[PDB]
Amino acid sequence: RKPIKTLLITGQNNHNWQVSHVVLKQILENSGRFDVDFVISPEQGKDMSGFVLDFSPYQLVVLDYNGDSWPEETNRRFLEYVQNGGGVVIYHAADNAFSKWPEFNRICALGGWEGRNENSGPYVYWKDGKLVKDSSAGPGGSHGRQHEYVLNGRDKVHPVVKGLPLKWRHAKDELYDRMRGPGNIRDILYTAYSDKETNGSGREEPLVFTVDYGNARIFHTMLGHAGATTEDNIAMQCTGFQVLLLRGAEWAATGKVTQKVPKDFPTETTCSYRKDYKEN
């Protein structure tokens, strides 16, 4: 089969996007299943009027961006792409972007920072065997110290998770917690316990899920805080991070996952890595 034509939007981010955009392209392209094109925006505070994107050649859009609003024509074309059954991957702090764009916050379902709070929408978390909405006052977006943590599968059937272990240890990373937004989650794939003694929330927080937005296939992964270099980048070098990105990207583009469960998938107790961003 022909590789999946992918557009990766970057150029502004409070995170080290210079590292993450390169690594995201390598993870996807090293599988031989994706052909990735970068679009790099002007820097923060520069004229954005020329950052006019064409979504028509692509089956998948990967967001690695936060900061200045894209120009109105790009915003209109992005919404048209999504509403026409487009595939989207929301990666880590891309869900912080465009706090004042209602449509964008519905595409992410949950976001954080950029002044979000109870005015941004409810908390959504796992409580006593299901997702619950909680509109109580509080901050929109937090995380504790970076740490290894165990992801809990909440879906056994979804193409992205089918065949993967129910529990697996993710490499040292931030654990996003107290995220807020319209909360229109379609399928919850993975949650993790955010321990208060790691400066967490105390809740079982959603970290990997799909979003209910018309006929769009939206894969949201809050994992993968970018390291300072492509070599020292533990959260993204995690095999779990990479396998979920590859499967989520394939699913978002085509509605299906044709990738077998790899032999190097992490266990509940032991992290696994692909330091060079390839299954060898």
Nearer to Zn ion, 91 or 209 (CB): 91
Q: Which residue is nearest to Zn ion (CB)?
A: 225
Nearer to Zn ion, 23 or 53 (CB): 23
Smallest distance from Zn ion to CB 116, Å: 15
Among the candidate windows 27-35, 157-165, 206-214, 219-227, which touches Zn ion by CB under 5 A? Answer: 219-227
Nearer to Zn ion, 183 or 224 (CB): 224
Nearer to Zn ion, 141 or 159 (CB): 141
* CB 191 within 8 Å of CB 204: yes
Judged by CB under 5 A, how many residues of this single chain contact Zn ion? 2
Nearer to Zn ion, 158 or 225 (CB): 225
Is residue 170 a contact residue for Zn ion (CB under 5 A)? Answer: no
Identify the burial level of 187 via C-beta atoms within 10 angstroms of its C-beta, where 0-12 means exposed, 13-18 middle and 19 or more buried.
middle
Among the candidate windows 31-39, 118-126, 168-176, 246-254, which touches Zn ion by CB under 5 A? Answer: 168-176
Residues 171-200, one symbol each (x = binds Zn ion by CB under 5 A, - = not), give: ---x--------------------------
Smallest distance from Zn ion to CB 8, Å: 18
Smallest distance from Zn ion to CB 172, Å: 12
Residues 221-240, one symbol each (x = binds Zn ion by CB under 5 A, - = not), give: ----x---------------
Rounded Cα distance, 151 and 165, in Å:
10
Smallest distance from Zn ion to CB 9, Å: 18
Among the candidate windows 41-49, 120-128, 170-178, 235-243, which touches Zn ion by CB under 5 A? Answer: 170-178
For binding to Zn ion (CB under 5 A), which residues are involved?
174, 225
